[PDB]
């Protein structure tokens, strides 16, 4: 489940996935998710943002990109 | 940037290259361990959850990576060889650790940051204004630097770290700023044996002034200033020490101190100091104190603990409400019934009422005791503790007590299952004590009356291990140490239960206990030493040695404990029990070959008191007051020792138990024994000849001295008997000194020479006063001269410095306005009485009849005694009167020298010495008369009981001129006072400590040096009494109302026809050996005090046993039955 978008995820409702995710670009909100398995953030996130609202990561988060602002 | 909003993340790995990722955690977010292998900034913003916790900079971290933290972290670990820098920009880190691998590590702590623990394992540079609470500098951290000093530094390389600028930790630091004010800092307080309070304080801005206010334990405010009182102050640099006067009341003092400099008046500082000398007397709740007849003399102690209040439903109740106690199945149903009705409220009222006799007396409630349940639960929680404490204060307040003591026996171990206990007892006891102290202080802000808080504590190491001594001690005025039951029949071999010192390695003692307590931080000041008024017993002890440290078999029958009074009555040197002393432990014990008894006596009490003074302890506590001897000897010993004047050692004191050996003929002295109990000091169980000196035994009569059989502490002088060289016509005074070497106590001095008597063969005298205002020739009741040895004829009088018949004293003749009485007085039948006395002198040719000159209101002595010339004239005239009317001697009844009976007769200060010169001259003249007339003439006086009398006459200088003193051991109390008491009692009642008796009066004469054989004990054939006397204890020692209808002085004859069996019941004070009458109906209640046949028997017995010359009574006319006289006479013959 390897994202490159916008604000991708559910609304007022929690929603379960699994497997190794790879949010690979700036500005990508992810919301009311619950991720069994890993979260990757890659050098492709660059100098830009990535928000995570009421998320869960049962596996490993790995921040390899993002800037300071 | 990456935002982690109300999210959950686990482990996080950061290998961001080149410039940092910012990672933020918002709201309820939650992050696992962050592992840093690149550039990063953790931030926690608007965080309600926990966010980040553990962070580690790993060896994969690249050179010059930027790593910064903001937030609240747990463990942060710098473990990265690439010259790591950690920036901490805000927040907190519990433990930051710089690993041995992190070469040239730099840690930058921004100004608001707090690292609680920083651990250094490599030389580290710590920068910035951020704070480190403890830097742990291990060897690898040697030479680390801090721009701002850590709060504390630990670890082996502590002393190698550098701090502060180039100035050195904390910097140039200067100034300021405008200091000036006088501040007072308290250093400490101390007491000494003399009961001085010493206050030491550092006074900054010493301007040669300060003001101290002391509050006594009884509430007296008192002020001291450098101005009025620099005599009591001593200044050094900041050091100033205030020193009170000697002899302050024992217990807790409150003080305030402050300095000034003209106007600029310092902060007032306050505290508590403790004055040595407390005596805590435990008093049992299960005695009915209102009915008790053994008495309580609260002058001998400072504190009275009511033992005990109990715990029911987590509150404090009287012991009658404690079912564990009242329903003990081991006693009888009738025993339980007494327990259920235990008179606690009556008791408590009687005991606080003893304040009248000692106004400084504090009374506390002691809560708990052996087998008292409820403490573990009471202390369990903040609300259980609240009910309890409030309850305790209610008890204290309900009975008007002065404080609270707890005796929990014991926290944690519960005395091994006797009571309920738990591990938490230990902190819980601390909290409970804290609370009580809080509440008592709270209440005192309202009442302005200070309240004590104290405990009783176990002597064992188990006990000290179960409580928080250093923690509880600040809440306590003192700890009462239970330095008794140290050993007991539970031990397989005998030892001492309450010894002062440990004589062998496994014997516990007061000293072992006090050393244990001092070794745990408890101050000496706050330690009361315990003593016991009971023994511990072992049965079936092997019959070896002295019984001490010997094996014991079965304790099945054993009483366990025997109270001291019972030991005195039936064991100590009685019934085959030998008294022994352990001179290393300083403790006595008994052994009979099978039973061993360890106990506390007069000697162990003195060693214990001396230990207390020597170690500057708080005082002496004992369990329990009611177990003492009849005389309260243990209580009295304790008081004497702790209140002894520094610089004067105590003298050995004696009394007499057997003071007469009587000649069988003019020259044959039978064998006999004098016995003298010690009143102060304790004989060695076995004395030696050199420990006692006896003088006055006739030449060629041998004697030995030994300890008296069947007495605990008395000398026996065994007179062998034999043939005295010449006839013995008068008594021989025998004097016994008990030397310092006789006693167990260390630094006493010799007793005064005690007087006892060898009586000549006719025995004691029996002297009757015969009133001259009775016409004896015509009186149907006659004088029986076979029952008297002596008569005093009352009276001749003094007119114009000449001795005259009583009809020539116009003051007396006209005393009453009755013209009948005046005529009868003018015609007083003296000549007829003198012919009558002469006929007496035929049917008892050995009778002596003396003329008494003087009596009540009789004038002329002070004038007669004034110069050699007036003495001469009075003496010559008294002698002419003596011969003219056929008298065999002269008695002088001067009532009274110096004080004149408070203005009834003329008096002067000079009467004191002139009385001595008067008697001396009278004895000289009567020697002359005797040597002219072929016979011996007596000279005697009548003398009074009051200390003012004793002080107004030179008793030790006058006895030599006198055949005897007829001491008026009567009129002690009467209508001039409002409270009832015995007017003539032979002993002082147990219920009126310090009161008058024959015993007390005749002892005081002896302590002035008068020989026993020059004393005559006085009986009164009349009564005194009071009206409006409450019907409580049949009127005895009761406050009485208006005395306008007082019965005055009825004679025994009046008693017979008007009082006996007329609504009066006869009672008996057995301790006083005195009768009294009560009639609830007569005049608001009427109480009568008199002598009867029984009391006169005992006066007579007293005379015989004390070696007195005899007995006298006033007067023959007052008992026409002959029974009062017959009682004396039969006992003196017996
Ligand atoms: Na946190």
UniProtKB/TrEMBL annotation, chain A:
This is chitinase. The gene is chiW. It comes from the Bacteria.
